[PDB]
Design a protein around this ligand. Structure first.
Ligand SMILES: Nc1nc2c(ncn2[C@@H]2O[C@H](COP(=O)(O)OP(=O)(O)OP(=O)(O)O)[C@@H](O)[C@H]2O)c(=O)[nH]1
Ligand SMILES: [Mg+2]
Lengths: 101, 389, 115, 308, 456
C-alpha cells in the first residue's frame, strides 16, 4: 500500500504490514466502496510476501513464522473485502502441532 | 503408365511425336519429405507423379494430357543426394585433398548434367526456397557458356544424324531455353511485387554479368512474360495433426498459368523471340516430337551423360578456384618457408638432424597453406630429406 | 550447526548408555550437508574398550578439542548439554522399551555375544 | 556510488560503412575489460542474421521489431530484394558481449546497388570479395561465427566458409573461431531425431576439413531423452472448455525457449585469447581495425580476385 | 479420411468391428515398422491382422496419423456402444509402445494424447466403463514426467488442469487413491520441470484447485522456491500458498536442492567472474541503482563459460551465486570494482557502520530511503545480500586459514592472504551483528560467535 518511505528501516515492515491491515479492516466496520480496498490489500500482499521471498534468500528453512501469518491474514482480509465473507477464508489455523507456534 | 526415369527413357526403340515440350527442373532444395522438384512436377501436371512417403540422378516424365516432358535433375547441390554423398563419404568411400577432389568431381558432374538441360530443353525452372536470388548461380551460368561453346562441336559431331532439324544442329539446342526461377516463401499483392523485384534483380545481374546476351545465349530474358514465381508458404506430415484440432472441436497464377504462359509459346510454335537490342531476331521454335527428341537426347546423353567432353571440364576454371588458390598458396609457402629454414637454420651436421629442423619447417609452412593443401607437404618433406646426405 | 550439535549429543548419550568405543577421527563421520554425525560400525561396544590390549580410555564419547569448539560456546552448560538432558528424560521415561530390547538381544542364539 | 559508472547502448553502431570503410564510433562504448565476447553472424540475403543478434544481445522474442537494435526486414522484403544491413554493425550488451551482424554474404541486393551505383573488372566478382572480407574479419576478430541459414545445407555456404579460412590472415598456431549453424525459420521436420542425425552427418562431412571449432558445445540443451546418437556438433535450430483452447502441434520447442537456450550458449561460448595478447575491449578495437586494413589490402584477396 | 468415418460411424457393428480391426491392425503394424530403424522390440502385437506391410519410411507417420484420427469417430458422442477394442483402452494399450519410443518419433505420442483427451472431453468422470476415471490419472501420472518435448507437457498439463476442475466440481474420487495420491505427486515434480513459465502456471493453477490435502508439504516446498522465480509465476505461487492450507509452512524437499547446488558451485573456483560485471552487482548491493536492466539470469549463463547448476537458474540460486562470484573476484589483491584493497575494505566498513548505527537511531540513506512500493522491500533484500556477501567473503577470505575440502585452494595468490592479515579488519568491524540482527537473526551468530569467542 505504498508504505511511508520516511526512513523506513529494514525489516520494520512487520509493523507497516500490520498497521495497514487494520486500515483495510477498520473500514469494513465503517461501511458494513470496497473497490479501493483490494487495491490497498493486494498491493499490500505484494509487499507482505516479500518477507517470505527473503525466507528463500539465500537459504532458510520454513521460517519465518511470525511474518507468514501476516501474509495469510492479509490474504484473508482481501478475500473478506471482495465478498462479504460468506464461507472463506477464515482462515484455518488449527493444530498445526509443530508445536512451537 | 509413364515411368519417371531418364536413362531407361532414352533406351527406347504409343505416343510417338506428341508435339512435346520438355521442361528442365534443377536447383537446390532443403531436407524435406517431398522434394521441391517433385512437388512442382506433381502440381504442374495436376497429379501426384512422385508419390511421397551422390550422383546427379536425372529423371524424366512425360505428361500425355499436357505434352510436357519434365526432366528433373538431382544435382549434388540438392540436399537429397548430398545426404547420401555425406553418408557414403562418412563410413567408406578420405583426406582433405581427396574430399575436395570428390566434391569438385560431384560439382563437375552436376554441371555436365545441367548442360544436358541447357542443350536439349525449351523451358527451365530453377528451385531456391529462399526468396533471394542465389548469386552463385551467376558464376554457374557464366561457367556453362564455356562448356556450351567449347563442347559445342563435340555435341554437333554427335547429333548430325538426327531429325532434329537445321537450327537445332546449328545451335545444338531446340531453342533458347527460358529460365523461369521458382522460389518458395518462408515469411511474408505483397507477393506480386516481390516477383517483379526478383525479376528486375535477376535481369540486371545477368545483364551486368553477360549471362543474358542479345543473341542465342544460353538463357533468355522473358521480358514480356514473367520468369520469377513465388510459392505460397503442408509438405510434411502436419496436415493430419492440424485436422485433429478441427475434428476434435466438432491473377496470381498457381503452377499452371505461370508455366502455361511459356509452354504455349512452344506447343503453339510461337517461339522464344523475347530478345532486345534490335537484333536479327533469330527465333527457331523447333517444336520437337517424342521420337525425334528421344533420338537426339540418346546421343546427347551418350556424349555427356564423352571422348573430348571429359577433357573439357578443365576448361571451366570458374568453379574450382579453390584448388588453384590452394596450389598457389602452397607454391608460395614452400620455396619461401622451406628455403628460409634450410638456410636460416644451419644444421650443418647431417647426422640425425633433418627432423630436428623439419619439426619447425612445418610450423612455418602450416601458417601459409590454405584450402585443399598439404599435398606439397609430401612433396616438401623430400627437400628437407634430400639436402641431408 | 544446530543439527550437528543435536546429533552429536544424541550419539554421545548412546555411547554413554551403550558402551560404544573405538571412536577415532574416522569412525565419527560428519554430513556436511545435514550436519548430523554418523558413526562407523560399532566393533567396540558395551564397554569393550575397557578390556584391551589398548591403553584403557574412559571417555563416554568423543569430545575432542575440534568438537567442543564446534557448538555455540562449548559442551558443558551449552546447547549440547541442554539437549542431552532432554534425551535422557525421553529415554528414562521409556526405559522399558530399551530394557526389554536389550534383554531380547541378549541370551541370543546367533548373536555371538562372546566379543 | 560514482566509482562504478556503467554504460549502455540503444541502437547499433556500424564499424564498416556501406562502402566498406572502418568507423571509430565504437570506442565510446568500449571499456578496459579483458574477457570480451565477440560473436558475429554470416548468412545469405534473407537468412535472418540480425533478428537473431537482436534477440540474443538485448532484445527478447516478445518485443516489437522496430525496437530491435539491428534493423530487421519489415517492409523491404515485399519490395525489391532485401539487404537492410548495409555494413557490419556493432553492439555491446550489458554483459560486454560484442555482436557483429554483418551484411548478407553473396546477396543480390548489394549486387544491384553496385550495378546501379570499383577497382575491379566486374561487380559480380566484387560482391564475393566483400563477402570474403567480412568472413575473414569475422574469423580473425570474433570468438564465435553464427552461420545463419534460412534453408538447410546450402552447399554454397559450406564451400564459401572453406574459402574464407584460406583468406584468414594468420601470424598477427592459427586462431580459428567457432561456428554456430543456426537454421533460422526451421520447420517441424528439422526438430526430428532422424533429421537431426542427417543434419549432423551432412554438416560434419561438408565441414570435415575446416580447422574451425564447429562441433562440441551445442545441440544438447532442449531435446527428448535422446542420448548422443550422432557425432554431436554446434547446431542450434531456431523455429519460425479447456480442451478447445489447445494450441496446434508446433512440433518444435517454443520460439522463446529456443532463443533463451541459444543466448545462454552464445554467452557461455568459450572465449579463447586473441592473436597474441589479452586485447581488452579497448585493445580489441585497436586489433580489429588493423585486421580490417590488413584484409582490405591483403595479398590473399588480391590473388583471389584475379582467379574470379 | 472421410471414408474412415463413413465406415466406422454407421450401425451394423458386425462390419464396424472388421473396419476397426483392419485400421488398428494397419496402425499396430506400421508402428513396429519404425522399430527396426529404432532397434526396438516389436510390441502392441495384439490387434494386428494378417497384413505384413513394409513401409520402412516416413509413410509410417502419415499412416498412423490417419488411422488414429479416423478412430475419433468412435471416440465421440453419442456412440452408445462399446463392442469394439475399446478405443478408450486402445489409447492406453499402446502406451508402453507409443510413449517409450515416441521421443525418437515425436509424432504419435501427441496425436494419441489428443485423441484420448478428445474422447474424454465428452465423458470424463462419472463414478459400464468405471475404471476410466481412474485410468486417466494413472496414465497421466506415468506420462506426466517422462520428460518430453514442449508440445507434450502443454497438453498433458492442460488435460490435468481441466480434470482438476471436474474433481472439485466429485466427490470421493480423491480417495482412489493410487492415482490421485500420485497424480498430485507428479504435479509436484511438474511444477518446476521444465522451466517454461507456461507449464508451471498450468500446474500452479491445476494444483490450486485441489485442497487437497494429502502431501501439501511438497506443494509448500515448491512454492517456497517458486515465490522468487522473478516471472509471472510468482503471483501464481503466492496465490497457491495463500490458498492451499496453513499450519504446513510452518510444517525442505526443494530447499535442499538449492543448498546442494550452491555447495557444488562453491567448490569449483571458476575464476571468470566478469570483473567488469561485478561492479553492477556492488552498485546493486551497496546502492539501489540497478546497472543491468532478469538481468541476473543473463549473468549465470554468461559466467562459467561452458565451455554446474540445474536448469532452474531462478532465482535465489543465481541471486546467491552472483554474490559468491563477486566475492571470488574480490578475493584477488585488487578489487577492480573499487580502489585498492584498503579502499574497498574502507567502503564496505563505512557502508556497514552507517547502517548498523541506524538501529539505535534514525537516519536516512540509500539503504532505507525507497520512494516506491515493491522497492522498500528490496532494501531488506539489500541487507540480506550484503550479509551473504560478507559471509561468503569470510568463507573465501580463508586463504590464510587454509580452508578444508569444503572449498578448494583459492589460487596462487594464497600467499597474499597469509602475508597480509584481514582478520584485523574483521575484528575491528564486527558491527555486522547490529546490521544483521535486524534483517536476519542468524546472520549475527556467525560473527557474534567469533568476536564473542576470540576475545576470550
Ligand atoms: N530469421 C528469422 N526471420 C523471421 C522469422 N519470422 C519472420 N521473420 C522475418 O524475416 C526477416 C529476416 O530476418 P532478419 O534477421 O531481421 O533479416 P536481416 O538480419 O536484416 O538480414 P537481411 O535480410 O540480409 O537484411 C525479418 O525481417 C522478419 O520480419 C524468424 O522466425 N526468423
Ligand atoms: Mg540484417
Amino acid at each position: 500500500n505504498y508504505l511511508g518511505n520516511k526512513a523506513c528501516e529494514c525489516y520494520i515492515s512487520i509493523a507497516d504490514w500490520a498497521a495497514v491491515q487494520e486500515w483495510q479492516n477498520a473500514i469494513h466496520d465503517l461501511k458494513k466502496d470496497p473497490r479501493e480496498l483490494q487495491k490497498s490489500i493486494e498491493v499490500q500482499l505484494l509487499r507482505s510476501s516479500v518477507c517470505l521471498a527473503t525466507a528463500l534468500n539465500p537459504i532458510e528453512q520454513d521460517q519465518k513464522w511470525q511474518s507468514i501469518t501476516e501474509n495469510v491474514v492479509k490474504y484473508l482480509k482481501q478475500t473478506s473485502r471482495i465478498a462479504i465473507g460468506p464461507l472463506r477464508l477464515s482462515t484455518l489455523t488449527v493444530s498445526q502441532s509443530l508445536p512451537v507456534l | 503408365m509413364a515411368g519417371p526415369v531418364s536413362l531407361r527413357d532414352l533406351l527406347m526403340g504409343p505416343w510417338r511425336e506428341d508435339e512435346i515440350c520438355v521442361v528442365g527442373i534443377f536447383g537446390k532444395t532443403a531436407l524435406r519429405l517431398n522434394s521441391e522438384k517433385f512437388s512442382l512436377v506433381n502440381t504442374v501436371c495436376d497429379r501426384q507423379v512422385f508419390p511421397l512417403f551422390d550422383y546427379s540422378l536425372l529423371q524424366a516424365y512425360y505428361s500425355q494430357e499436357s505434352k510436357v516432358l519434365y526432366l528433373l535433375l538431382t544435382s549434388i547441390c540438392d540436399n537429397s543426394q548430398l545426404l547420401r554423398a555425406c553418408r557414403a563419404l562418412q563410413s567408406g568411400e578420405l583426406p582433405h585433398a581427396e574430399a575436395h577432389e570428390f566434391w569438385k568431381h560431384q560439382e563437375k558432374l552436376q554441371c555436365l548434367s545441367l548442360l544436358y538441360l541447357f542443350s536439349v530443353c525449351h523451358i527451365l525452372l530453377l528451385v531456391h526456397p529462399t526468396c533471394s536470388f542465389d548469386i552463385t548461380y551467376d558464376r554457374v551460368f557464366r561457367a556453362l557458356d564455356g562448356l556450351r561453346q567449347k563442347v559445342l562441336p563435340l555435341l554437333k559431331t554427335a547429333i548430325k544424324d538426327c531429325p532434329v532439324g537445321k537450327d537445332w544442329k546449328l545451335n545444338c539446342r531446340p531453342c533458347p531455353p527460358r529460365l523461369l526461377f521458382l522460389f518458395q516463401l518462408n515469411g511474408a499483392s505483397p507477393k506480386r511485387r516481390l516477383q517483379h523485384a526478383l525479376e528486375d534483380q535477376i535481369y540486371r545481374i545477368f545483364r551486368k554479368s553477360r549471362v543474358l546476351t542479345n543473341q542465342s545465349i544460353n538463357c533468355l530474358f522473358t521480358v514480356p512474360a514473367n520468369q520469377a514465381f513465388v510459392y505460397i508458404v503442408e509438405d510434411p506430415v502436419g496436415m493430419l495433426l492440424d485436422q485433429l484440432r478441427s475434428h476434435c472441436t466438432v491473377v496470381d497464377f498457381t503452377l499452371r498459368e505461370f508455366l502455361w504462359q511459356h509452354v504455349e509459346l512452344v506447343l503453339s510454335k510461337k517461339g522464344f523471340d523475347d530478345s532486345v537490342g534490335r537484333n536479327p531476331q533469330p527465333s527457331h521454335f523447333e517444336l520437337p516430337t517424342y521420337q525425334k527428341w528421344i533420338s537426339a537426347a540418346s546421343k546427347l546423353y551418350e556424349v555427356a551423360i564423352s571422348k573430348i567432353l571429359s577433357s573439357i571440364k578443365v576448361l571451366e576454371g570458374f568453379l574450382d578456384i579453390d584448388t588453384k588458390f590452394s596450389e598457389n598458396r602452397c607454391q608460395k609457402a614452400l620455396p619461401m618457408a622451406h628455403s628460409a629454414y634450410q638456410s636460416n637454420l644451419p644444421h650443418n651436421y647431417t647426422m640425425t638432424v633433418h627432423k630436428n629442423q623439419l619439426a619447425q619447417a612445418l610450423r612455418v609452412y602450416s601458417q601459409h597453406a590454405r584450402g585443399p593443401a598439404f599435398h606439397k607437404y609430401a612433396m616438401q618433406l623430400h627437400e628437407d630429406c634430400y639436402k641431408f646426405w | 550447526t544446530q543439527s550437528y550439535a543435536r546429533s552429536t549429543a544424541v550419539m554421545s548419550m548412546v555411547g554413554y548408555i551403550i558402551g560404544l568405543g573405538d571412536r577415532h577421527l574416522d569412525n565419527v563421520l560428519i554430513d556436511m550437508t545435514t550436519g548430523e554425525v554418523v558413526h562407523i560400525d560399532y566393533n567396540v561396544c558395551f564397554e569393550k574398550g575397557k578390556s584391551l590390549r589398548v591403553p584403557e580410555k574412559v571417555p563416554f564419547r568423543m569430545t575432542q578439542n575440534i568438537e567442543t569448539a564446534l557448538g555455540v560456546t562449548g559442551v558443558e552448560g551449552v546447547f549440547r548439554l541442554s539437549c542431552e538432558q532432554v534425551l535422557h528424560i525421553m529415554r528414562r521415561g521409556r526405559e522399558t522399551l530399551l530394557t526389554l530390547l536389550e534383554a531380547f538381544v541378549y541370551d541370543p542364539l546367533v548373536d555371538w555375544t562372546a566379543g | 556510488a560514482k566509482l562504478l559508472p556503467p554504460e549502455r547502448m540503444k541502437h547499433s553502431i556500424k564499424l564498416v560503412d556501406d562502402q566498406m570503410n572502418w568507423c571509430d564510433s565504437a570506442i565510446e562504448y568500449l571499456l578496459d575489460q579483458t574477457d570480451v565476447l565477440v560473436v558475429g553472424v554470416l548468412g545469405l540475403q534473407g537468412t535472418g542474421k540480425s533478428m537473431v543478434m537482436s534477440l540474443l544481445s538485448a532484445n527478447t522474442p516478445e518485443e516489437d521489431q522496430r525496437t530491435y537494435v539491428f534493423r530487421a526486414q519489415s517492409a523491404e522484403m515485399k519490395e525489391r530484394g532485401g539487404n537492410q544491413t548495409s555494413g557490419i554493425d556493432f553492439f555491446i550488451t550489458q554483459e560486454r558481449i560484442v555482436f557483429l551482424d554483418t551484411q548478407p554474404i553473396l546477396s543480390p541486393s548489394i549486387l544491384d546497388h553496385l550495378i546501379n551505383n570499383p577497382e575491379y573488372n566486374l561487380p559480380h566478382t566484387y560482391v564475393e570479395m566483400q563477402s570474403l572480407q567480412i568472413a575473414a574479419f569475422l574469423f580473425t576478430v570474433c570468438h564465435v561465427v553464427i552461420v545463419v541459414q534460412d534453408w538447410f545445407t546450402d552447399l554454397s555456404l559450406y564451400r564459401f566458409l572453406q574459402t574464407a579460412e584460406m583468406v584468414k590472415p594468420s601470424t598477427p598456431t592459427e586462431y580459428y573461431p567457432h561456428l554456430v549453424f543456426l537454421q533460422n525459420k526451421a520447420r517441424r521436420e528439422d526438430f526430428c531425431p532422424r533429421k537431426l542425425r542427417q543434419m549432423h552427418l551432412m554438416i560434419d562431412q561438408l565441414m570435415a576439413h575446416s580447422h574451425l571449432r564447429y562441433k562440441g558445445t551445442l545441440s544438447m540443451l532442449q531435446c527428448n531423452v535422446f542420448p548422443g546418437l550422432p557425432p554431436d556438433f554446434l547446431d542450434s535450430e531456431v523455429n519460425l472448455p479447456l480442451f478447445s483452447l489447445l494450441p496446434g502441434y508446433r512440433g518444435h520447442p517454443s520460439f522463446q525457449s529456443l532463443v533463451s537456450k541459444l543466448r545462454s550458449q552464445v554467452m557461455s561460448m568459450a572465449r579463447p585469447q586473441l592473436s597474441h595478447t589479452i586485447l581488452t575491449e579497448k585493445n580489441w578495437f585497436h586489433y580489429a581495425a588493423r585486421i580490417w586494413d590488413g584484409v582490405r589490402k591483403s595479398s590473399a584477396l588480391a590473388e583471389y580476385s584475379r582467379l574470379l | 479420411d472421410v471414408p474412415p468415418p463413413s465406415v466406422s460411424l454407421p450401425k451394423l457393428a458386425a462390419l464396424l468391428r472388421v473396419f476397426s480391426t483392419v485400421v488398428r491392425s494397419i496402425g499396430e503394424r506400421f508402428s513396429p515398422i519404425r522399430g527396426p530403424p529404432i532397434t526396438e522390440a516389436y510390441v502392441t502385437d495384439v490387434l494386428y491382422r494378417v497384413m505384413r506391410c513394409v513401409t520402412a519410411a516416413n509413410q509410417v507417420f502419415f499412416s498412423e496419423a490417419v488411422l488414429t484420427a479416423a478412430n475419433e469417430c468412435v471416440g465421440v458422442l453419442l456412440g452408445s456402444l462399446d463392442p469394439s477394442m475399446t478405443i478408450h483402452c486402445d489409447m492406453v494399450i499402446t502406451y508402453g509402445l507409443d510413449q517409450l519410443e515416441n521421443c525418437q518419433t515425436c509424432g504419435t505420442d501427441y496425436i494419441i494424447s489428443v485423441l484420448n483427451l478428445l474422447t474424454l472431453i465428452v465423458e470424463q468422470i462419472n463414478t459400464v466403463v468405471a475404471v476410466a476415471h481412474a485410468v486417466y490419472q494413472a496414465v497421466l501420472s506415468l506420462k506426466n514426467i517422462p520428460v518430453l518435448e514442449t508440445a507434450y507437457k502443454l497438453i498433458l498439463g492442460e488435460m490435468t488442469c481441466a480434470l482438476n476442475n471436474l474433481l472439485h466440481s466429485a466427490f470421493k474420487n480423491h480417495v482412489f487413491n493410487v492415482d490421485n495420491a500420485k497424480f498430485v505427486v507428479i504435479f509436484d515434480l511438474s511444477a518446476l520441470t521444465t522451466i517454461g513459465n507456461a507449464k508451471n502456471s498450468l500446474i500452479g493453477m491445476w494444483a490450486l484447485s485441489p485442497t487437497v490435502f494429502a502431501l501439501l508439504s511438497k506443494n509448500l516446498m515448491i512454492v517456497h522456491s517458486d515465490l522468487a522465480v522473478h516471472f509471472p509465476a510468482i503471483q501464481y505461487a503466492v496465490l497457491y500458498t495463500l490458498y492451499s492450507h496453513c499450519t504446513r509452512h510452518d510444517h525442505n524437499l526443494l530447499g535442499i536442492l538449492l543448498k546442494k547446488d550452491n555447495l557444488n558451485q562453491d567448490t569449483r573456483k571458476l575464476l571468470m567472474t566478469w570483473a567488469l560485471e561485478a561492479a553492477v552487482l556492488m552498485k546493486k548491493s551497496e546502492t539501489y541503482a540497478p546497472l543491468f536492466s532478469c538481468k541476473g539470469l543473463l549473468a549465470n549463463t554468461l559466467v562459467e563459460d561452458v565451455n554446474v547448476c540445474r536448469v532452474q537458474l531462478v532465482h535465489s540460486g543465481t541471486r546467491i551465486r552472483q554474490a559468491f562470484g563477486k566475492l571470488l573476484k574480490s578475493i584477488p589483491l585488487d578489487v577492480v570494482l573499487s580502489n585498492n584493497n584498503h579502499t574497498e575494505i574502507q567502503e564496505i566498513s563505512l557502508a556497514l557502520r552507517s547502517h548498523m548505527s541506524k538501529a539505535p537511531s534514525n537516519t536516512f540513506h540509500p539503504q532505507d530511503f525507497s520512494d516506491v512500493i515493491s522497492f522498500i522491500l528490496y532494501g531488506n533484500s539489500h541487507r540480506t545480500g550484503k550479509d551473504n556477501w560478507l559471509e561468503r567473503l569470510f568463507y573465501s577470505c580463508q586463504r590464510l586459514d587454509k580452508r578444508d575440502q569444503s572449498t578448494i585452494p583459492r589460487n596462487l595468490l594464497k600467499t597474499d592472504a597469509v602475508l597480509w592479515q584481514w582478520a584485523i579488519w574483521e575484528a575491528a568491524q564486527f558491527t555486522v551483528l547490529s546490521k544483521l540482527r535486524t534483517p536476519l537473526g542468524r546472520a549475527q551468530d556467525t560473527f557474534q560467535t567469533i568476536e564473542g569467542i576470540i576475545r576470550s
